[PDB]
Coordinates of C-alpha atoms in Angstrom, one line a residue:
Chain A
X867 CA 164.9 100.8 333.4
X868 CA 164.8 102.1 329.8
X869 CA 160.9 103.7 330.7
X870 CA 159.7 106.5 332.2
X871 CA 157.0 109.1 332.8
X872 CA 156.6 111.6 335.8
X873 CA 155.4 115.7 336.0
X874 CA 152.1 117.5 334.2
X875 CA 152.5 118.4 330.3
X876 CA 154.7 121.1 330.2
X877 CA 156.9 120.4 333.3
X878 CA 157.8 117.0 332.6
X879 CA 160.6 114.7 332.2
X880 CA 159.7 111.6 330.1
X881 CA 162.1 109.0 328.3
X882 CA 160.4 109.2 325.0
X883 CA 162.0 106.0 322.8
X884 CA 165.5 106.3 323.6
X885 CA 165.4 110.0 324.2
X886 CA 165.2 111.7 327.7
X887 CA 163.4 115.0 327.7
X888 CA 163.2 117.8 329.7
X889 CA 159.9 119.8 329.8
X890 CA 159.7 123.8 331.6
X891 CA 156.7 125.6 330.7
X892 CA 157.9 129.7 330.1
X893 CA 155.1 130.7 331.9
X894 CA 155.4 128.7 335.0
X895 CA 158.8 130.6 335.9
X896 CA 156.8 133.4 336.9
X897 CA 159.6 135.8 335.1
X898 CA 157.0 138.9 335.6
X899 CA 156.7 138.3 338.8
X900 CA 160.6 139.0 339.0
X901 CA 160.1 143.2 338.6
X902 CA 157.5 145.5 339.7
X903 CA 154.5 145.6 337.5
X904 CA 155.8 149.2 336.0
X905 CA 158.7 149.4 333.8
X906 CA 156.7 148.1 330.7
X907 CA 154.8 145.5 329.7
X908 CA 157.0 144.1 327.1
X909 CA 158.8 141.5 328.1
X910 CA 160.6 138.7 325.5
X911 CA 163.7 136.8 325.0
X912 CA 166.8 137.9 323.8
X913 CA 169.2 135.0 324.3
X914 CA 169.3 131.1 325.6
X915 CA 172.3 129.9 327.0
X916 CA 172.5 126.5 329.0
X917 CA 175.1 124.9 331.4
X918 CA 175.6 121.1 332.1
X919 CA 177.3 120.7 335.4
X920 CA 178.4 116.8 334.2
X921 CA 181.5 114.7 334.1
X922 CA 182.0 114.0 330.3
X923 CA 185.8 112.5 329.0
X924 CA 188.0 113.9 326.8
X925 CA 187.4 114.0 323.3
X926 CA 183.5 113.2 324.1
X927 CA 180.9 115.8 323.5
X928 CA 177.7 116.6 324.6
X929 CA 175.0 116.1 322.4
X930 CA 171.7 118.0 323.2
X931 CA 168.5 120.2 321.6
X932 CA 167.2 122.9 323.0
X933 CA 163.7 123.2 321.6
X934 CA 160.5 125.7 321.6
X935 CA 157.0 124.9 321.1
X936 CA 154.9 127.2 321.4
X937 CA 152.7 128.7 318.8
X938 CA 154.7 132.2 318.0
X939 CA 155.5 132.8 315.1
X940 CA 159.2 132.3 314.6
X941 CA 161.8 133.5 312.2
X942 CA 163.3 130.3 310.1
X943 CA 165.6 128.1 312.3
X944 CA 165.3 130.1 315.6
X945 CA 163.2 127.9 317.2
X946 CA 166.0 125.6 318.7
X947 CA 170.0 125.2 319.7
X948 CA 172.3 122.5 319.5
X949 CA 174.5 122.3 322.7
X950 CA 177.9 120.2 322.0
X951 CA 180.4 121.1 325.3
X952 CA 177.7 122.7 328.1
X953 CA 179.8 125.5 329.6
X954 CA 177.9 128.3 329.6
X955 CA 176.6 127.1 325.5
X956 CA 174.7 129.1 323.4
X957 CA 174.9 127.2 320.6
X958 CA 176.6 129.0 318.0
X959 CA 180.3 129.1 317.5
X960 CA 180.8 132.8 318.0
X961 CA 177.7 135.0 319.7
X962 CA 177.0 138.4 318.5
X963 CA 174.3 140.5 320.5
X964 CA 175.1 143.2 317.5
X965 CA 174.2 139.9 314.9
X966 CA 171.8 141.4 312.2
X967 CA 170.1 138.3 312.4
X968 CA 167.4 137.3 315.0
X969 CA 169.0 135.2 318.0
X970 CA 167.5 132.5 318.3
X971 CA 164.3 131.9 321.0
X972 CA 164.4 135.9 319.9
X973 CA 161.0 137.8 320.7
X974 CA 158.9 135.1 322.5
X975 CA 156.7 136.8 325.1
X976 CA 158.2 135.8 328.5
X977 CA 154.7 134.9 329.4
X978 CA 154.5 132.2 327.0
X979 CA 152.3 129.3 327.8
X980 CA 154.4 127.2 325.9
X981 CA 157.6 125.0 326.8
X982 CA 160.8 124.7 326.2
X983 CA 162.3 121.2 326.1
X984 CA 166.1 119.6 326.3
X985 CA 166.6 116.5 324.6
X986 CA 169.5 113.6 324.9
X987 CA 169.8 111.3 322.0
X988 CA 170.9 108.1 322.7
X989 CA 170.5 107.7 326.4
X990 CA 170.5 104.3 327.1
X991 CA 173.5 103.9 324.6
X992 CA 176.1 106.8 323.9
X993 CA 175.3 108.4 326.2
X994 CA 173.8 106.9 329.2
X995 CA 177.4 107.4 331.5
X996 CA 177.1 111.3 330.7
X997 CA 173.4 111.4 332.1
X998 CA 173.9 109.0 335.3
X999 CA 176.8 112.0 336.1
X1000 CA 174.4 114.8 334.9
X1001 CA 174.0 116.8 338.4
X1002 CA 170.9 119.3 337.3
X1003 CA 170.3 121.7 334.1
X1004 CA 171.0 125.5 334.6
X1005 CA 169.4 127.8 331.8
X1006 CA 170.5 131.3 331.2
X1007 CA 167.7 133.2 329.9
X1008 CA 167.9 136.9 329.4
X1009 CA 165.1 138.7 328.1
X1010 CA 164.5 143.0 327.3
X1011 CA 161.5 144.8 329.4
X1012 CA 159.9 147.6 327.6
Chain B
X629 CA 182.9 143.7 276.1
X630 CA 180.8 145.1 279.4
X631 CA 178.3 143.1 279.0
X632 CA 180.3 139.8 278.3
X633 CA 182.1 140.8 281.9
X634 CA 178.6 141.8 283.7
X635 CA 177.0 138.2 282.7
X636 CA 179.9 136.6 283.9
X637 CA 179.3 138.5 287.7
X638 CA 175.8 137.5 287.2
X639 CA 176.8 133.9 286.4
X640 CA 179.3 133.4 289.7
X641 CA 176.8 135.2 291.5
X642 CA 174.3 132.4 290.9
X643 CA 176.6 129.8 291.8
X644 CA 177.3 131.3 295.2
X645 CA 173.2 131.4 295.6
X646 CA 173.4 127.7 294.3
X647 CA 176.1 126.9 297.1
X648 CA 174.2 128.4 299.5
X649 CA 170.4 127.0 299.4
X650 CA 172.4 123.9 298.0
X651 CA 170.2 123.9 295.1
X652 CA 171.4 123.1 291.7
X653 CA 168.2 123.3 290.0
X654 CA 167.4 127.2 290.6
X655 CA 168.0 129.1 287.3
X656 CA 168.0 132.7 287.0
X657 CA 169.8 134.2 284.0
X658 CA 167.9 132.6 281.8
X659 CA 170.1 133.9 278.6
X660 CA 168.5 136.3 275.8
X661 CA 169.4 139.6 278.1
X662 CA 170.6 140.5 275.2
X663 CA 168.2 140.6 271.7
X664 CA 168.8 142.5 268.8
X665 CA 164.7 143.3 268.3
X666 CA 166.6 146.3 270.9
X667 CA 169.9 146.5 269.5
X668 CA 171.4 145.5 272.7
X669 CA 169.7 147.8 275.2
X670 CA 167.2 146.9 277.9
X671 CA 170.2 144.1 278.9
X672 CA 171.5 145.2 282.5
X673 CA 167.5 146.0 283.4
X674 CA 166.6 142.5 282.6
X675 CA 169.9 141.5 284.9
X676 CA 168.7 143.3 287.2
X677 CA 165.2 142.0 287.5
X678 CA 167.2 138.4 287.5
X679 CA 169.4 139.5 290.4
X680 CA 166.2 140.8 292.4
X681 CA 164.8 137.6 292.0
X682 CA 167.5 135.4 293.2
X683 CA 167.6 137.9 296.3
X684 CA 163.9 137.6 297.0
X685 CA 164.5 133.8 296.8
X686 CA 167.7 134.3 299.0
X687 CA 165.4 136.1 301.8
X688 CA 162.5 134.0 301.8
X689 CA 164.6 130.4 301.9
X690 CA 167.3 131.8 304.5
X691 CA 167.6 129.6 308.0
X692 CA 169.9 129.6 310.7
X693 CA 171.6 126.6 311.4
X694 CA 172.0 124.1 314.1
X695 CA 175.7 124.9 314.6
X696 CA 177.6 121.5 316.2
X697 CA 180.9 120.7 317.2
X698 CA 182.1 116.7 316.5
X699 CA 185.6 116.0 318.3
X700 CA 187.1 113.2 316.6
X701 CA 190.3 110.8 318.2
X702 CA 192.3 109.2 315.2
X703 CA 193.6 106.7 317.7
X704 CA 189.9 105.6 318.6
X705 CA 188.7 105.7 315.2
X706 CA 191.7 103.5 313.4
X707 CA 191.2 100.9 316.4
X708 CA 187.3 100.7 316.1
X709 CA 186.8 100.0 312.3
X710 CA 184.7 96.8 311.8
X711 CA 186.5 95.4 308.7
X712 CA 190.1 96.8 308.4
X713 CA 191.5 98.4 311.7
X714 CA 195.1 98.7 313.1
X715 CA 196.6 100.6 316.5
X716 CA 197.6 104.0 315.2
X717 CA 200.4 104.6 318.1
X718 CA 201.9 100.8 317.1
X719 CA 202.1 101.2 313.0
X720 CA 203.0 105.0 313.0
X721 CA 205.9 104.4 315.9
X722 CA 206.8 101.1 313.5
X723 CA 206.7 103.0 310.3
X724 CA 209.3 105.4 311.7
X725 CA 211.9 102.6 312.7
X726 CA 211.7 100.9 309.6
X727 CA 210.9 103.8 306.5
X728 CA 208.1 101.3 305.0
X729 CA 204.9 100.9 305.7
X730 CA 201.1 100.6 304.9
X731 CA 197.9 99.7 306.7
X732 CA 194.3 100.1 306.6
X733 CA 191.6 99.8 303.7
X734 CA 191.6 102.6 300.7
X735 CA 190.2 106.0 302.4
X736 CA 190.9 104.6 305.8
X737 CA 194.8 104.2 306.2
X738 CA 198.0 105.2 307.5
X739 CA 201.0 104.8 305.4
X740 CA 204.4 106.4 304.5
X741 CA 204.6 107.0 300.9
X742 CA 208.2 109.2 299.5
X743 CA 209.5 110.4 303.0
X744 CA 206.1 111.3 303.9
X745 CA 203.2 109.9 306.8
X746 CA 199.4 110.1 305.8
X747 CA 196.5 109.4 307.9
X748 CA 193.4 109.1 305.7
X749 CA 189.8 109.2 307.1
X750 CA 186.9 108.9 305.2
X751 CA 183.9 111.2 306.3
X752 CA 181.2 109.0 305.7
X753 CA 182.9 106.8 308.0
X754 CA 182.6 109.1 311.1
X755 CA 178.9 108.5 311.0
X756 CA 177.8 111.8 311.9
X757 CA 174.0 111.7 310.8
X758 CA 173.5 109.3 313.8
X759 CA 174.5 112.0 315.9
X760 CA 171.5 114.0 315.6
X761 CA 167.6 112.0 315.2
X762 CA 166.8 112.1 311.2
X763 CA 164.8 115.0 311.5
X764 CA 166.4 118.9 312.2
X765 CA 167.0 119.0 308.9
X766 CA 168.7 117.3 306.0
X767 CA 171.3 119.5 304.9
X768 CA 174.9 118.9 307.1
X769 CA 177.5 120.5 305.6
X770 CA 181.3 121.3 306.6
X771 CA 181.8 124.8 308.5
X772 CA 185.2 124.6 309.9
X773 CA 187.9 122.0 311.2
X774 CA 190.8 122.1 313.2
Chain C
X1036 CA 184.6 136.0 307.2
X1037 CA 183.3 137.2 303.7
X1038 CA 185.1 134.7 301.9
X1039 CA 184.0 131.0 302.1
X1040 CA 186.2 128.7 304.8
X1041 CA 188.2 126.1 304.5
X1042 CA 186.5 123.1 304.0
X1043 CA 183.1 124.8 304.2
X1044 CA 180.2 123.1 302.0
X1045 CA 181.9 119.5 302.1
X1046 CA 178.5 117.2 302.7
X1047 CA 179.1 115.7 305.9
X1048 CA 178.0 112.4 304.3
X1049 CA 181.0 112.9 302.2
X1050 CA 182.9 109.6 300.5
X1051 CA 185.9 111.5 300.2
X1052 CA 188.0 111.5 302.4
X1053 CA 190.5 113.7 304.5
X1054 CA 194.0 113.1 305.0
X1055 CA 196.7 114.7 307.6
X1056 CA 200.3 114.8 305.9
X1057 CA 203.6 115.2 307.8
X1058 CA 206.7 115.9 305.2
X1059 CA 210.1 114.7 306.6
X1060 CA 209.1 112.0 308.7
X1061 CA 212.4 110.1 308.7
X1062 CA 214.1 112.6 308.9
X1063 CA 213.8 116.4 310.2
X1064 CA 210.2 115.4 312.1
X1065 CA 210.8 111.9 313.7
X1066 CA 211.5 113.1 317.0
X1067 CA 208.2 115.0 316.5
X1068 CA 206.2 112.2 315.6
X1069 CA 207.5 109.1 317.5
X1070 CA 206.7 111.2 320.7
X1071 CA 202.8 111.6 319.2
X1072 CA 200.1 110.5 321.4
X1073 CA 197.2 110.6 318.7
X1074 CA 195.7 113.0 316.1
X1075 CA 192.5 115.0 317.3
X1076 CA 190.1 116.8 314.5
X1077 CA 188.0 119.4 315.1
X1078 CA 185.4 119.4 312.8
X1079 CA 182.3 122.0 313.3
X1080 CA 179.2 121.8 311.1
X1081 CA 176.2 123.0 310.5
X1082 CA 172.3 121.8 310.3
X1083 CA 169.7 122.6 308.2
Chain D
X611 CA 157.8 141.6 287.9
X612 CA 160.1 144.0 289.4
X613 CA 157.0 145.7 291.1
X614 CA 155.7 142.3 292.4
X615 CA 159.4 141.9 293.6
X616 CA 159.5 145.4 295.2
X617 CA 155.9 145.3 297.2
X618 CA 157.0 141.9 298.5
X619 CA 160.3 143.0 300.0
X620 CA 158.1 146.2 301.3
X621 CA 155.7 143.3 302.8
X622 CA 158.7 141.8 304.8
X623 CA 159.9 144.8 305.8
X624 CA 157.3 145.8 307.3
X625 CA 156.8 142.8 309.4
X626 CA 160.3 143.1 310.5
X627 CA 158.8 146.1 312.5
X628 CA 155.7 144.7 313.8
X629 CA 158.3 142.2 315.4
X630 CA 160.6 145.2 316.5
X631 CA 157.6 147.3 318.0
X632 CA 155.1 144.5 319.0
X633 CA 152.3 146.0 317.6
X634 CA 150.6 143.9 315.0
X635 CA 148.1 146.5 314.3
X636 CA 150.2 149.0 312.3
X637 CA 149.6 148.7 308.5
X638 CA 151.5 151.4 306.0
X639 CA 151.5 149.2 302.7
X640 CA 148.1 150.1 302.0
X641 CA 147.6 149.0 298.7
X642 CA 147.0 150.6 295.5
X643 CA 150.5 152.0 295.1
X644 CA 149.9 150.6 291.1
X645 CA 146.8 152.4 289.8
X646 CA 145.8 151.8 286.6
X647 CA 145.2 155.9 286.1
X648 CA 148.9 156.0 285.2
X649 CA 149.5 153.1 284.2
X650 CA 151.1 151.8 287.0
X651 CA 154.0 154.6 287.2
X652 CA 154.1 156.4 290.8
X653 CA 154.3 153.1 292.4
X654 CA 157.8 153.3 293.3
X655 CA 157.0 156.9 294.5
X656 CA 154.2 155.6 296.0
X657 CA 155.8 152.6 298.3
X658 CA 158.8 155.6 299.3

């Protein structure tokens, strides 16, 4: 039934016009809470990868955004990824860690009280067969402490 | 004559600035570098006030891109057209029996012109704004193809 | 790569169009081409 | 120009390591690099 609402802002998954979208606020992961309070204070992103566990077909890809919204201030397209084949995707067609760019989702506080949202285009349409086989979202977030 | 060679780096510099914020209208070597009120002289300084410009403008209007991957399946493409489609196994297998052959609309066609098979595709055709929702960006150029 | 790519800059909005050539068709590469199943193309671009 | 150029690359520079070090209170283009008392020499000195 091409509605839908369920979840608080921020953790939420909503079929917004045509578009399914997934809501995880940053700070609701409790990431802090992962390593002792010592070992520094500092703690952002360094690199967003996700994986989509789904049967898709041959010669079919995988269209998705990965998006921020918070209020950080952000270097110039680093605020969101485009996943096309969801193995393990960052995004980009070759990954550096050495880039002497920022990465994108680079330097948010991983206390952020903002969310970061996935979005399907045409999900009731194109793409409605890959979503019905999705089996859950997996994020790979690694963040620096300092 | 060093002067007639450094303009022409400045000049093919611009256009690769031009290419890259795909901008025609930016103008930075203005012409008159060189003015006889200074019998020549004072020319590579005002160059290279025009080449810190178009760097200044370079840094400030930089963005990463949404990097995407389309996969695209002649077969399905030939056999879905609205107006002029064909079976691309069928006509290719029957242009190789009989060494004639021609099919599809101009820009969208397989034939066998001299000894030789061409599959044409037109890039408009492929509809790949609809991929992605009308905002992200406007600019979606060609990276790489295989 | 510090020179541009192949293809690199084409609008993807493009009217042109692309086309795959096979030379010696008839010929040296029938056996190749009769036992095609279809032509796949790869095409990675960027948004901004 | 090339001055107004130069203290705006400094500018962005030095934002690139507010990023680096998290500390937005750190300020070392201080202003009055250009002083009319020579005027405006020592400001490349100056922003060095």
């Amino acid at each position: 039934e091409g509605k839908g609402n369920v979840g608080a802002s921020g953790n939420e998954l909503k079929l917004s016009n045509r578009q399914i979208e997934a809501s995880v606020r940053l700070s609701d992961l409790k990431i802090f809470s992962d390593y002792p309070e010592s070992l520094g204070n500092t703690r952002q992103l360094k690199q967003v990868s996700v994986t989509l566990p789904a049967l898709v077909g041959p010669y079919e890809d995988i269209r998705a955004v990965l998006n921020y919204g918070g209020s950080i201030v952000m270097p110039r397209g680093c605020s969101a990824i485009a996943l096309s084949h969801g193995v393990n995707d960052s995004g980009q067609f070759m990954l550096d860690f050495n880039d002497s760019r920022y990465l994108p989702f680079e330097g948010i506080s991983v206390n952020d009280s903002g969310s970061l949202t996935l979005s399907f285009p045409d999900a009731t349409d194109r793409q409605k067969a890959l979503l019905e086989s999705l089996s859950d979202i997996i994020l790979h977030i690694r963040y620096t402490i300092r | 004559q060093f002067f007639d060679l450094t303009q022409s780096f400045c000049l093919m510099a611009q256009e690769a600035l031009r290419r890259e914020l795909t901008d025609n209208g930016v103008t930075f070597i203005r012409g008159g570098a060189w003015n006889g009120t200074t019998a020549g002289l004072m020319a590579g300084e005002t160059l290279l006030l025009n080449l810190a410009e178009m760097e200044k403008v370079w840094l400030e209007r930089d963005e990463r891109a949404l990097e995407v991957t389309r996969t695209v399946s002649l077969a399905q493409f030939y056999q879905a057209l609205s107006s002029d489609n064909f079976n691309l196994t069928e006509k290719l297998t029957q242009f190789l029996r009989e060494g004639k052959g021609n099919v599809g609309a101009s820009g969208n066609e397989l034939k066998l012109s001299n000894r030789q098979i061409e599959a044409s595709v037109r890039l408009s055709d492929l509809k790949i704004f609809s991929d992605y929702p009308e905002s992200l960006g406007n600019t979606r150029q060609l990276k790489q193809v295989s």
